[PDB]
Amino acid sequence: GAAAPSESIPSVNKAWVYSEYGKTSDVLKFDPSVAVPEIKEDQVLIKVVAASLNPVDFKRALGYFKDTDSPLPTIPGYDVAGVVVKVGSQVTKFKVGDEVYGDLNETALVNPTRFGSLAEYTAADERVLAHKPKNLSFIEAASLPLAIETAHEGLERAELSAGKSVLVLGGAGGVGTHIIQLAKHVFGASKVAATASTKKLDLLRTLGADLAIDYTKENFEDLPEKFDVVYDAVGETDKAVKAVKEGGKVVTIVGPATPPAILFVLTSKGSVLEKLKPYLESGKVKPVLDPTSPYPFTKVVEAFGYLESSRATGKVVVYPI
Ligand SMILES: NC(=O)C1=CN([C@@H]2O[C@H](COP(=O)(O)OP(=O)(O)OC[C@H]3O[C@@H](n4cnc5c(N)ncnc54)[C@H](OP(=O)(O)O)[C@@H]3O)[C@@H](O)[C@H]2O)C=CC1
Ligand SMILES: CC[C@H]1OC(C)=C(O)C1=O
Numbered sequence: 001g002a003a004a005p006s007e008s009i010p011s012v013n014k015a016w017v018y019s020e021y022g023k024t025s026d027v028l029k030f031d032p033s034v035a036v037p038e039i040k041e042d043q044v045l046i047k048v049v050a051a052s053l054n055p056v057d058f059k060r061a062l063g064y065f066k067d068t069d070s071p072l073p074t075i076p077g078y079d080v081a082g083v084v085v086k087v088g089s090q091v092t093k094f095k096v097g098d099e100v101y102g103d104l105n106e107t108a109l110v111n112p113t114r115f116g117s118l119a120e121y122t123a124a125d126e127r128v129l130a131h132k133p134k135n136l137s138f139i140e141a142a143s144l145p146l147a148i149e150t151a152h153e154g155l156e157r158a159e160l161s162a163g164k165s166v167l168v169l170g171g172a173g174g175v176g177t178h179i180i181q182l183a184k185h186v187f188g189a190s191k192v193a194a195t196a197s198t199k200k201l202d203l204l205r206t207l208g209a210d211l212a213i214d215y216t217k218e219n220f221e222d223l224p225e226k227f228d229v230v231y232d233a234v235g236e237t238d239k240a241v242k243a244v245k246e247g248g249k250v251v252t253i254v255g256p257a258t259p260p261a262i263l264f265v266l267t268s269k270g271s272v273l274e275k276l277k278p279y280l281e282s283g284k285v286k287p288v289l290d291p292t293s294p295y296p297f298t299k300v301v302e303a304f305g306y307l308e309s310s311r312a313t314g315k316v317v318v319y320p321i
Helices: 055-061 138-143 145-157 176-185 198-207 270-282 297-308
Strands: 012-017 029-035 043-052 079-087 099-103 121-125 129-131 165-169 191-196 211-214 227-232 244-252
Touching: 043 138, 043 145, 055 297, 079 121, 079 138, 079 145, 099 138, 099 145, 099 270, 129 270, 145 176, 145 227, 145 244, 145 270, 165 176, 176 191, 176 198, 176 227, 191 198, 198 211
Parallel strands: 165 191, 165 227, 191 211, 227 244
Antiparallel strands: 012 029, 043 079, 043 121, 079 099, 099 129
16 A cells, blocks of 8 residues: 555545535535545545445534534535545554545544545544455445444443343434344343334344334333343433333433433444454344435435435445445
8 A cells, every 4th residue: 555646636526515504405415526635644535435324414414513513514424435545644554545434523523524425535534444344345334333333332331241131222223223233242132122113123133132122012111121221222211211120221322311311422433343343244243224225426315315204224325426
């Protein structure tokens, strides 16, 4: 990985951009000529191959986090997979030509980049990236970082460990599909229970749930079974706290959190992906893609509209970019 010829990297590129807050159907526009970000010394420039959408992208675009956002206009997209084309002078872990993936924003709600992953090129901090597993496609890799890292961090915050039981509220989404798989296959849970609607129960079982609960037909909090860990990925902490054993832990990623549940927001770290690499290489933990994925780069507004419906099964990914 010697440097690319500097004139081989463009200074403008195609991207999706919004200039004011609002609904993606209203504000998200394609721009054929936006600046390619200049890298800082601890960043790399990536030729984007694929990107995933996350709810944070649309919530951010609605202005929910305006007080700590970066300045508009914004090119959205946190999740990226692609190929390194330039490395900053303090970078040690990556070279030109490395295939990488990660969630661009170390702190999702505080100064996320102006120059996201829904663009042909993006700048990424070395610290948020990992080497792409050779057995995963770029679509598959792009689908992973924000969700899998949120799953991982919530389970560590809940102190999940071998032999314990866990209940996942929202098992079929981008995050929940990884909560299940990590809980069973990485954290050694004895029993994994998860909620979803009627047609999604078989998927939950396939991913590692021992008990799949149809929330449209029964109320988990009214079951006699109580769990060592409850991980809420929906926003139902009032009920979650009724399903935990005394001394157990309840975490949520959708606030506000009713004590004793806690709310956290993930920290994006390439080291987490690196820790998970063997499970990803062996197939013990798999990417989960929505059947409508991938969406071409022309169809980003439609991809957002689908994610905004709250019905995605696993991940919504944009490819080719
Ligand atoms: N705090 C943080 O760090 C983070 C927070 N988040 C937040 O967490 C939430 C989940 O994100 P993500 O997984 O990407 O979202 P998705 O849009 O991928 O979740 C969609 C899934 O939610 C399921 N679902 C919806 N309502 C319910 C319910 N009441 N019970 C069970 N399942 C339900 C749907 O299954 P069905 O069709 O069966 O209802 C669908 O499969 C979002 O609000 C997001 O903003 C996400 C990541 C990090
Ligand atoms: C309430 C958490 C906020 O942060 C992330 C990453 C989301 O998806 C949110 O809504």
